[PDB]
Motif scaffolding. Structure first.
Motif, PDB file in Angstrom:
ATOM      1  N   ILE A 923      29.930  71.000  -6.272  1.00 45.98           N
ATOM      2  CA  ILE A 923      30.027  71.001  -4.808  1.00 45.98           C
ATOM      3  C   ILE A 923      28.439  70.064  -4.166  1.00 45.98           C
ATOM      4  CG2 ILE A 923      28.998  72.390  -2.394  1.00 45.98           C
ATOM      5  CD1 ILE A 923      32.311  72.254  -3.224  1.00 45.98           C
ATOM      6  N   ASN A 924      28.505  69.142  -3.840  1.00 54.64           N
ATOM      7  CA  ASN A 924      27.343  68.473  -3.732  1.00 54.64           C
ATOM      8  C   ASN A 924      26.697  68.174  -2.052  1.00 54.64           C
ATOM      9  OD1 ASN A 924      27.848  68.224  -6.428  1.00 54.64           O
ATOM     10  ND2 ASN A 924      29.249  66.139  -5.852  1.00 54.64           N
ATOM     11  N   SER A 925      25.582  67.417  -1.970  1.00 54.19           N
ATOM     12  CA  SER A 925      25.156  67.676  -0.722  1.00 54.19           C
ATOM     13  C   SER A 925      24.199  66.579  -1.012  1.00 54.19           C
ATOM     14  CB  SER A 925      24.605  68.017   0.189  1.00 54.19           C
ATOM     15  OG  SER A 925      24.596  67.735   1.439  1.00 54.19           O
ATOM     16  N   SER A 926      24.193  64.988   0.004  1.00 50.38           N
ATOM     17  CA  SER A 926      23.470  63.995  -0.570  1.00 50.38           C
ATOM     18  C   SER A 926      22.732  64.218   1.173  1.00 50.38           C
ATOM     19  CB  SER A 926      24.230  62.565  -0.820  1.00 50.38           C
ATOM     20  OG  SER A 926      25.203  62.206  -0.360  1.00 50.38           O
ATOM     21  N   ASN A 927      21.583  64.756   1.104  1.00 52.94           N
ATOM     22  CA  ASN A 927      20.753  64.106   2.199  1.00 52.94           C
ATOM     23  C   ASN A 927      20.171  63.077   2.439  1.00 52.94           C
ATOM     24  OD1 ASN A 927      21.764  67.124   1.126  1.00 52.94           O
ATOM     25  ND2 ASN A 927      20.573  67.848   2.632  1.00 52.94           N
ATOM     26  N   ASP A 928      19.196  63.134   3.110  1.00 57.55           N
ATOM     27  CA  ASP A 928      18.029  62.063   3.826  1.00 57.55           C
ATOM     28  C   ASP A 928      16.658  62.851   4.699  1.00 57.55           C
ATOM     29  OD1 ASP A 928      18.536  60.732   6.628  1.00 57.55           O
ATOM     30  OD2 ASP A 928      20.574  60.847   5.398  1.00 57.55           O
ATOM     31  N   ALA A 929      16.186  61.444   5.718  1.00 59.43           N
ATOM     32  CA  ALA A 929      15.111  62.325   5.891  1.00 59.43           C
ATOM     33  C   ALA A 929      15.763  61.280   7.288  1.00 59.43           C
ATOM     34  CB  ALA A 929      14.009  62.280   6.074  1.00 59.43           C
ATOM     35  N   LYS A 930      14.829  60.983   8.442  1.00 60.85           N
ATOM     36  CA  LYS A 930      15.190  59.740   9.941  1.00 60.85           C
ATOM     37  C   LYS A 930      13.911  59.644   9.696  1.00 60.85           C
ATOM     38  CE  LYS A 930      17.271  61.643  13.111  1.00 60.85           C
ATOM     39  NZ  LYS A 930      17.117  62.433  14.731  1.00 60.85           N
ATOM     40  N   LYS A 931      12.821  59.720  10.332  1.00 62.16           N
ATOM     41  CA  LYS A 931      11.795  59.042  10.201  1.00 62.16           C
ATOM     42  C   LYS A 931      11.040  59.550   9.800  1.00 62.16           C
ATOM     43  CE  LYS A 931      12.811  57.909  15.337  1.00 62.16           C
ATOM     44  NZ  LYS A 931      12.377  59.059  16.557  1.00 62.16           N
ATOM     45  N   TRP A 932      10.742  59.081   8.277  1.00 61.05           N
ATOM     46  CA  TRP A 932      10.043  59.740   6.909  1.00 61.05           C
ATOM     47  C   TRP A 932       8.168  59.075   7.117  1.00 61.05           C
ATOM     48  CZ3 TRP A 932      10.568  63.695   3.939  1.00 61.05           C
ATOM     49  CH2 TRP A 932       9.642  63.656   3.496  1.00 61.05           C
ATOM     50  N   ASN A 933       8.245  58.374   8.103  1.00 63.04           N
ATOM     51  CA  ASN A 933       6.788  57.665   8.793  1.00 63.04           C
ATOM     52  C   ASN A 933       7.256  58.060  10.273  1.00 63.04           C
ATOM     53  OD1 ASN A 933       7.787  56.378   6.529  1.00 63.04           O
ATOM     54  ND2 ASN A 933       7.153  55.171   6.854  1.00 63.04           N
TER      55      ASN A 933
END
Ligand SMILES: [Mg+2]
Ligand SMILES: [Mg+2]
Length: 1935
Positions: A923-933
């Motif tokens: 069971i996997n999830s590949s996340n991220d971030a909207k505004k890293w700066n």
């Protein structure tokens, strides 16, 4: 863990071997951490209840670590090797092993307490230094030595060892070492340079004083109180509990009310509801967009701004034809009259002269160009029209032209002109380059490439590229009023009229054609409509911005790549012509359209359709929801193409949102059923879809300056500025449930830091902060001020440039950093740790950072760049190093440890299988971030960094970070200029002072900023913070999994990988029943979904670009792990495979063209496509060299044809198979042995350039660039006047060059004073290619200039090199293997490759389609962790100056230096003398020449199908997907019996008896077979037809004696040979001659002669063996007789200029006759462990024709079992010996005390000492056996990090209790996976026979003996001092 198997793994060839060191690391779960009870007392130490001795504890760190290795009797060096009396006879190794094949193995172990590769490499080097020379001396005096040497070094991080192991033993060693180091440190030498640097840095840190008060003043929220209160107070617990409960219940409610889990609907109803909602949302978007636009239904316009014309190119010429008529050029007038006047004026006299000559543009004959101005007076109407020339669209526009254009279009049909001017000019060079490999494969691939080049699309693109180059050239001329320029395109009947401007941002042009040579058209309809003029066809003055130029130049070399790649991916043969599949036209047409029409917001839709299509991989508990991508799609539309793309994208979204992708695991593997292209209606497999999301990708660094994109950048920079909290309270002082846009809870930060610190302190051993502090102090204290990051970018933005229109009408012109280091070195500073003390003060006296901006044009990626000023770089570099050091020792981060990029995902599978039992579910999830700066307030970074520091750094880090809370950013001057004539409408008002905004001051030319970290500057602190957050998440997930929803416990392992921004989570479980699977899936779904709501607490906002809860697929950076199948987008690098790069020297472009090709191969592409990509790359490289611009290309072509040397423009192409495998060095090496290049290099190394001081000396001045070498005319180019002027402003005397030659010592040692520092700066400013000229213009024109200028200047005039033909005649005034090896330090691997490559010269193979996915391997080509060799430059520094840059040793140093001298003729041991003889003019050119002469190719991580693998397999499979490329049993038993008799305990006579009887009984195939080693076997077998020719032909080794010396009798009865004799022989086709002589005590070698030189390094050792046979010394010198290649002393290499030893004077016709030996004097002989077939050539002097030694890899067991079932062999302890298995041990118990036998003597006692082998399966040490009670390491668990217990929210509990979910009905449908038999996740991952036989050949000798030794005793035998009965067994053992 036993030594026998380990030493049996390695196979060695005759001589001394060191192997290759390999690095193993931690993969599996770390075991250990038992009950540790250390009490130091009188008797030493105690542990658990075992007590160890004190001084033994002083060394337990190594004894315990290697307890299972040293069990021998502690032999010495003398006991194995002959005595040398060199003092080293008392050198005691750690293990000296001698297996039954005499293969000596000396091994020493070591253990270091470092944490990186540094200490590991250091220990390796110091061990090699300790043990190098004595073993070499001892091996120099042996007969047939096969000695291996290996080192083992261990650390808590990894293990470095050259002997292959398995990860299990590495883990065992590492954890044993952890325990041992722990008990060691609980129970309780560097060099001088580092010892100085550590103190130099510690002093500075101790006396560093930042003004904290002025800092608190000049910066908003910099207060030490925050830091100390964060460090001191602990973390709350109740707050965290209630916050987690609230967030959890909120996330649960959101999930239920967002995925329609209420009340009871089945999957289909939820899916149709989702479909209806998606339809509604798309409908609303379409309506809201159409509502604000000029509502139109048909917009007559075009997309391709160029007219479709396909002329047949004629003979090349650059001139306007005149005889054209004008009978119709006045029909229209307002455009026709212009062209009529143009032609009439250019006809007679109106043209003028405008020379645009290369030497001008670089800002430094008949090469000069001729352009014509204009002044045609036009009528008032046409003049007014020209002076006149030079709304968002609606989603419903009926864009069907684009529709039916992608269906039927003559775009790939063959243009019938395939043999014309340009194609000839290319194909000739192509064939010349390919002539090196004239196989059928190369011809077929070249024909395919030419067929591709014959298509009409590239034919259209070629003249477009020509036009673009011409326009880029004419971009910057002088503009007269009403002026124009008429030009021809040099290959096509096309004419262009140009009107430049002053802004230099666009251009105006109009095309014309004769209307009678337009052969074909692209028969499309999206094309700019032209106008008729009778016998002409013209255009209407379009305008092309300067930014959209490179994309027009690079059009053919991307159309070709797209065509080839898509034709291959579909599954078509690259050597079989077919029709367009009608599924291929769509992709090519779409690429063409997106490429030509070049904007953002149009390809953005395509690069965004991935996040939309990335759904449908969602698991039943959730539903695919692509509607999150609505928004980021709104905005205006301005082309007919964007409308079509948007409609197709919305249709794809609504199609996807109705049904997910199916999931059917038919066999043990898994797949996904229904996929389809995004913008199309298709159905293709995964790999066809994945790299379809990358259609419009490209890269650049051109620094675009269009005002629009720059405005968008300025907008993006300031977005969340006004969202400041306006309260210095929630920015690091207190906790907060609901945080605002820039806040973060402190206690959660402390919890995350504690979790990560505990994880670090558990992976490595505790007391790690000290190692880290010392590492940082060292790495800082050694940074000299000279070796900084020179040639970087800086900013000349000071306080003065702060008032617009007060400093304007100027240029900013940012500069380099070298000027700063120059003006610093002037001020008397040497070490970097000295400049900061004043740089910080200089910064603090200001109030900002003075940041300037920079933007390239790549439509997406990392576009922004923030250049700083030197005073900021100098303080940021001292902190980023600490950040990177702290980050490097983390287990998650993947930017400091790059290899972990491909380890934490694959190996996870194995881990899952380990502590779960096979058959788990992912069971996997590949996340991220909207505004890293712009979202990271810079205090969290300071806190999370100061948490990891030893408190000697707190003040410095706090200060150096507090400088980011008020920064000023520059802006373009043209921007403010044009602006001072939506968001921009607010910016202009803020500038003009009307509307007040909180960043831009009134009237000032900058932008203020208080919030947000800059991108690229703080690169590692962000990764560290993300690592802390991800570690906390992992701990929390492990916690929640430990206890089920209702007191149960689901079992599963969690994994967390994360880099800068992107991150993944890879949980995995194993259910047993059916229902528990459902419960656990729901639980893990909620758990994984809670991350979006848990993120905002840490100041991290997860975007909507992240999938969640996917079953069997992840995505970390750009690679997608689809179960056991890994898919990588290869279109990315294919598209970005030809980037224009400005480097000041030729032969440096091909380096990058090969680098990008290697990167593409790494990305994954069959060689048959890599070769086509390389052909396109060659086309690009030649088109960027004046192929279509300068008219004098025929002369350059003719010059290059007769000279294939690189650095003159020639392009080398690799082998078709294995194309992009090895780098440029491999192609150079292969070409330097077949072409004339081998001549041109030989002259460079074998000419003493005295030449009586003539006018032909020095030839081309030595000058190496990159890896290659060439003439100094090219590398000297480039403007440097600013730099040398600056140096002259300082104390640099003009004599410096001369002043350098007087003392070169300043060129290798660092520095002593200020003056030599200035000399080193001066040498730095000239050599490599450092430039100073401003990029005041374009790139393509000045690159074509930098090419053609050098080319012409070398072609005709001087510089000090000569002409081409002058050097060609200077030739008549090649390489030998010695210098060929000294140049390429990897020649042997190249030879191996080439040998494996000379078998595929034909096109033979089958189209067998294998299974779904052949799970490939992970093959690594030539690649080592650090090094083992000394570089060819350090020997010079040592010999010449005494600096021991290498640590070989006097003997070895002399040997290697002598080899080097024998490599370079003119090279001498005098630094001053070596200039007046070798090709040079200054003592600086040689310094640069020697530092780059030798170069190694790069590594390659290529995948290959298994069998574990080889290179032949890869070449078989990887040439093309779905296609392969290809061309007893008595031998085994014979090898086995031969090895068992020869090494078996017997007598030589008895040995030969058994051998000859075995030969009698057995048979053999005839010698008409392969001849590697069975040749000798079948020869000696058939020695019982005519053997003479049998040995003569078929590569024997024999030779008579033409001149016997003499016979002489020593009175002690000795037949000595004195005089001068001549021996001759014929070994491996050389027909050598050996003149020998000796008159005193013995004989000596006089001279040698060879007919060839190919196989030289083997003939040398063959002659060594022959002299050893006939007994001749090789020590005395000789009198030199001729012009020898080299000379040899002690079977060593010596130069010809020394005249030291016997010279080998090769003469092709030196000796051609044979001796005609008699076949009757032929005998067989059996020496100990050696078989020989020989002949006596003289009385008492024999000669070994052939020899044999048995290996150890032929001890069979099947053959043994067969021999067991045989009785007729009267030949067979012997019975239990050959056939491994009345009694045997009873008789020989006492046979050793009294010798009574008719068989072997001492040999049996040497053999039967192997009872220690069976005793090795038991009898370990005490502490080594009591500490096996350890349990595995459970986990990290937040109850430990938080030190208290925590309860959790039982929402799902009460829900399943009441029954408001009915879980069993949610998952009904989609297939079940608990009982599904599947393979474990993961893709990538003779020991067997050798281990089996080494453990096997013990029992058959000591079976019952082991039983006796166990029965007599079992506990006291573990001790050796306790026994010091069974006197027979102990005698057998020893003593
Ligand atoms: Mg994705
Ligand atoms: Mg991602």
């Amino acid at each position: 863990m036993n030594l026998e198997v380990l030493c049996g793994r390695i196979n060695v060839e005759n001589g001394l071997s060191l192997g290759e060191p390999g690095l193993y690391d931690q993969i599996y779960d770390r075991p250990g951490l038992p009950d540790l009870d250390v009490t130091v007392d009188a008797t030493g130490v105690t542990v658990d209840l075992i007590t160890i001795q004190l001084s033994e504890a002083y060394k337990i760190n190594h004894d315990f670590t290697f307890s299972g290795l040293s069990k021998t009797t502690d032999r010495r060096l003398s006991e194995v090797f002959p005595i040398t009396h060199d003092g080293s006879d008392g050198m005691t190794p750690d293990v000296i092993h001698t297996r039954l094949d005499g293969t000596i193995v000396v091994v020493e172990f070591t253990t270091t307490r470092s944490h990186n590769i540094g200490g590991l490499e250091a220990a390796y080097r110091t061990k090699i230094e300790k043990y190098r020379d004595p073993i070499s001396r001892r091996v120099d005096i042996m007969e047939n030595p096969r000695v291996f040497f290996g080192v083992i070094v261990v650390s808590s991080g990894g293990v470095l060892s050259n002997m292959p192991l398995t990860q299990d033993e590495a883990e065992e060693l590492m954890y044993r070492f952890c325990i041992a180091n722990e008990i060691y440190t609980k129970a309780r030498q560097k060099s001088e340079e580092e010892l100085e640097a550590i103190s130099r840095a510690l002093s500075f840190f101790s006396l560093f004083e930042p003004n904290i008060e002025r800092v608190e003043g000049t910066f908003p929220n910099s207060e030490i109180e925050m830091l100390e209160q964060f460090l001191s107070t602990p973390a709350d617990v109740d707050f965290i509990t209630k916050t987690l409960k609230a967030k959890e219940v909120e996330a649960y409610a959101d999930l239920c009310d967002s995925h329609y889990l209420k009340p009871e609907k089945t999957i289909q109803e939820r899916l149709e509801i989702n479909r209806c909602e998606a339809i509604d949302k798309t409908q609303d978007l379409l309506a809201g967009l159409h509502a604000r636009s000029n509502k139109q239904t048909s917009l007559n316009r075009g997309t391709v701004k160029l007219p479709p014309w396909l002329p047949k190119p004629s003979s090349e010429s650059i001139d306007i034809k005149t005889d054209s008529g004008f009978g119709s050029l006045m029909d229209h007038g307002a455009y026709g009259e212009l062209w009529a006047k143009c032609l009439l004026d250019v006809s007679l006299g109106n043209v003028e002269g405008v020379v645009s000559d290369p030497a001008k543009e670089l800002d430094i004959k008949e090469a000069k160009i001729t352009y014509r101005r204009f002044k045609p007076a036009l009528s008032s109407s046409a003049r007014q029209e020209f002076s006149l020339q030079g709304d968002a669209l609606s989603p419903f526009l009926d864009v069907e032209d684009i529709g039916d254009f992608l269906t039927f279009n003559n775009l790939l049909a063959d243009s019938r002109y395939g043999d014309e001017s340009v194609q000839r000019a290319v194909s000739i060079l192509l064939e010349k380059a390919s002539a090196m490999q004239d196989t059928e494969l190369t011809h077929a691939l070249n024909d395919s490439f030419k067929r591709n080049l014959s298509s009409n699309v590239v034919q259209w693109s070629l003249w477009v590229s020509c036009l673009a180059q011409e326009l880029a050239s004419a971009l910057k001329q002088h503009c007269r009023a009403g002026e124009f320029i008429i030009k021809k395109l040099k290959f096509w009947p096309i004419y262009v009229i140009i009107k430049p401007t002053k802004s230099s941002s666009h251009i105006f042009y109009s095309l014309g054609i004769r209307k009678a040579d337009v052969t074909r058209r692209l028969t499309g309809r999206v094309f700019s409509e032209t106008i008729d003029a009778g016998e002409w066809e013209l255009t209407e003055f379009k305008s092309l911005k300067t930014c959209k130029l490179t994309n027009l130049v690079n059009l053919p070399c991307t159309m070709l790549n797209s065509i080839a790649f898509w034709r291959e991916k579909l599954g078509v043969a690259p050597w079989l012509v077919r029709k367009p599949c009608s599924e291929l036209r769509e992709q090519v047409g779409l690429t063409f359209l997106i490429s030509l029409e070049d904007k953002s917001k149009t390809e953005e839709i395509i690069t965004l359709t991935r996040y939309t299509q990335m759904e449908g991989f969602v698991s039943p508990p959730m539903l695919p929801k692509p509607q999150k991508m609505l928004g980021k799609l709104d905005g205006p539309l301005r082309t007919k193409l964007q409308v079509y793309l948007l409609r197709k994208h919305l249709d794809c979204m609504v199609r996807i949102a109705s049904q997910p992708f199916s999931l059917i695991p038919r066999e043990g593997r898994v797949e996904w059923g229904g996929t389809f292209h995004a913008i199309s209606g298709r159905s293709t497999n995964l790999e066809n879809m994945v790299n379809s999301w990358y259609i419009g990708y490209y890269k650049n660094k051109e620094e675009s300056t269009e005002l629009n994109a720059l405005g968008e950048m300025y907008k993006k920079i300031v977005e969340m500025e006004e969202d400041k909290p306006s309260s210095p309270e929630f920015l690091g002082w207190g906790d907060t449930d609901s945080p605002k846009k820039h806040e973060f809870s402190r206690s959660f930060l402390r919890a995350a830091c504690s979790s990560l610190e505990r994880e670090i302190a558990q992976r490595h051993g505790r007391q790690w902060k000290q190692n880290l502090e010392e590492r940082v102090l060292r790495e800082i204290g050694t940074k000299n001020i000279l070796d900084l990051a020179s040639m970087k970018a800086t900013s000349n933005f000071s306080k003065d440039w702060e008032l617009y229109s007060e400093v304007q009408t100027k240029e900013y012109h940012r500069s380099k950093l070298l000027e700063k280091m120059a003006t610093l070195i002037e001020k008397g500073v040497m070490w970097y740790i000295d400049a900061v003390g004043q740089a910080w003060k200089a910064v603090l006296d200001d109030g900002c950072m003075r940041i300037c901006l920079f933007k390239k044009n790549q439509h997406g990626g990392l576009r922004e760049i923030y250049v700083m000023d030197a005073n900021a770089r100098l303080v940021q570099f001292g902190v980023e190093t600490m950040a990177r050091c702290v980050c490097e020792l983390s287990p998650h981060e993947t930017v400091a440890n790059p290899r972990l990029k491909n380890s934490i995902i694959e190996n996870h599978g194995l881990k899952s299988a380990r502590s779960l039992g096979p058959g788990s579910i992912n069971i996997n999830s590949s996340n991220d971030a909207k505004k890293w700066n712009q979202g990271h307030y810079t205090t969290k970074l300071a806190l999370v960094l100061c948490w990891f520091m030893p408190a000697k750094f707190h003040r410095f880090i706090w200060a150096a970070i507090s400088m980011f809370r008020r920064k000023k950013m520059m802006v373009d001057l043209r921007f403010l200029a044009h602006l001072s004539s939506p968001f921009r409408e607010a910016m202009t008002d803020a500038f003009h002072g009307n509307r007040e905004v909180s960043w831009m001051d009134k009237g000032r030319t900058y932008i203020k900023t208080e919030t947000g970290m800059m991108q690229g500057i703080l690169h590692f602190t962000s990764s560290l913070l993300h690592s802390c957050v991800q570690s906390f998440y992992k701990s929390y997930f492990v916690s929640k999994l430990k206890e089920g929803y209702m007191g149960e416990s689901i079992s599963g392992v969690v994994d967390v990988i994360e880099g800068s921004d992107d991150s993944a989570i890879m949980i995995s479980i194993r259910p047993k029943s059916d229902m528990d699977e459902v419960r656990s899936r729901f639980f893990v779904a909620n758990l994984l979904h809670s991350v979006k709501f848990l993120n905002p607490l840490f100041g991290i906002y997860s975007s909507e670009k992240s999938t969640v809860n996917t079953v069997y697929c992840v995505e970390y950076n750009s690679e997608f792990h689809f179960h056991r199948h890994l898919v990588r987008p290869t279109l990315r690098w294919i598209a970005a495979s030809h980037q224009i790069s400005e480097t000041e020297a030729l032969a440096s472009r091909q380096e990058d063209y090969s680098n990008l090709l290697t990167q593409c191969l790494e990305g994954g592409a069959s060689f048959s496509l890599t070769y086509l990509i390389q052909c396109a790359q060659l086309l690009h490289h030649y088109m960027l060299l004046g192929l279509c611009l300068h008219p004098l290309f025929g002369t350059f072509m003719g010059m290059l044809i007769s000279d294939p040397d690189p650095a003159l423009g020639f392009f080398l192409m690799d082998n078709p198979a294995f194309a992009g495998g090895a780098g440029f060095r491999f192609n150079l090496w292969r070409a330097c042995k077949t072409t004339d290049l081998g001549r041109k290099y030989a002259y460079y190394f074998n000419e003493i350039q005295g030449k009586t001081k003539g006018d032909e000396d020095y030839r081309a001045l030595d000058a190496t660039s990159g890896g290659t070498l060439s003439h100094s005319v090219m590398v000297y180019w480039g403007d440097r006047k600013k730099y040398q002027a600056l140096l002259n402003r300082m104390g640099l005397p003009e004599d410096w060059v001369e002043q350098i030659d007087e003392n070169p010592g300043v060129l290798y040692r660092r520095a002593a004073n200020k003056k030599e520092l200035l000399l080193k700066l001066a040498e730095k400013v000239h050599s490599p290619g450092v430039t100073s000229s401003l990029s005041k213009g374009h790139v393509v024109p000045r690159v074509v200039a930098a090419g053609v200028y050098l080319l012409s200047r070398h072609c005709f005039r001087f510089s000090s090199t000569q002409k081409a033909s002058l050097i060609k005649l200077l030739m008549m005034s090649s390489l030998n293997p010695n210098q060929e090896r000294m140049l390429f330090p990897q020649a042997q691997e190249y030879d191996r490759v080439c040998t494996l490559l000379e078998e595929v010269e034909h096109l033979t193979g089958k189209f067998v389609v294998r299974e779904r996915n052949i799970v490939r391997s992970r093959i690594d080509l030539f690649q080592e962790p650090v090094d083992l060799r000394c570089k060819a430059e350090d020997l010079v520094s040592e010999v010449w100056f005494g600096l021991k840059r290498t640590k070989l040793g006097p003997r070895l140093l002399k040997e290697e230096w002598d080899k080097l001298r024998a490599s370079f003729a003119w090279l001498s041991t005098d630094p001053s003398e070596t200039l007046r003889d070798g090709p040079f003019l200054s003592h600086v050119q040689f310094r640069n020449f020697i530092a780059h002469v030798d170069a190694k190719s790069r590594s390659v991580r290529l995948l290959g199908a298994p069998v574990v693998t080889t290179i032949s397999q890869v070449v078989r499979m990887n040439f093309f997907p779905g296609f392969s490329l290809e061309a007893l049993e008595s031998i085994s038993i014979l090898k086995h019996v031969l090895f068992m008799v020869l090494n078996g305990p017997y007598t030589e006579e008895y040995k030969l008896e058994m051998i000859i009887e075995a030969f009698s009984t057995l048979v053999i195939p005839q010698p008409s077979e392969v001849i590697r080693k069975s040749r000798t076997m079948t020869l000696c077998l058939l020695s019982n037809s005519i053997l003479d020719q049998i040995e003569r032909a078929q590569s024997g080794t024999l030779g008579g004696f033409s001149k016997p010396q003499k016979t002489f009798i020593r009175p002690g009865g000795g037949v000595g040979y004195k005089g001068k004799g001549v021996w001759t022989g014929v070994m491996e086709d050389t027909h050598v001659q050996i003149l020998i002589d000796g008159d005193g005590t013995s004989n000596w070698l006089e001279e040698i002669r060879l007919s060839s030189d190919a196989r030289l390094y083997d003939v040398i050792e063959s002659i060594r063996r022959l002299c050893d046979d006939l007994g001749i010394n090789n020590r005395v010198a000789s009198a030199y007789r001729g012009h020898c290649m080299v000379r040899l002393s002690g079977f060593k290499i010596k130069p010809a200029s020394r005249t030291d030893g016997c010279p080998v004077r090769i003469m092709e016709r030196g000796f051609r006759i044979r001796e005609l030996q008699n076949p009757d004097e032929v005998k067989m002989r059996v020496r100990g462990d050696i078989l020989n077939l020989s002949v006596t050539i003289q009385e008492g002097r024999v000669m070994n024709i052939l020899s044999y030694r048995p290996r150890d890899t032929d001890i069979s067991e099947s053959a043994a079992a067969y021999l067991w079932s045989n009785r007729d062999l009267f030949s067979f302890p012997s019975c239990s010996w050959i056939c491994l298995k009345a009694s045997v041990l009873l008789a020989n118990d006492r046979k050793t005390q009294g010798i009574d036998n008719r068989a072997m003597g001492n040999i049996f006692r040497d053999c039967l000492e192997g009872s220690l082998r069976k005793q090795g399966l038991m009898r370990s040490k005490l502490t080594e056996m009591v500490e096996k009670n350890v349990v595995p390491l459970t986990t990290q668990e937040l109850v430990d990090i938080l030190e208290e217990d925590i309860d959790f929210s039982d929402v799902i509990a009460v829900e399943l209790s009441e029954g408001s979910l009915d879980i069993e009905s949610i998952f009904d449908g989609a297939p079940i996976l608990w009982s599904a038999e599947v393979e474990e996740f993961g893709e990538g991952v003779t020991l067997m026979d050798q281990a089996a036989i080494t453990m096997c050949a013990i029992m058959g000798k000591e079976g019952c003996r082991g039983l006796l030794t166990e029965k007599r005793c079992m506990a006291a035998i573990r001790e050796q001092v306790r026994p010091f009965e069974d006197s027979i067994s102990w005698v057998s053992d020893q003593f």
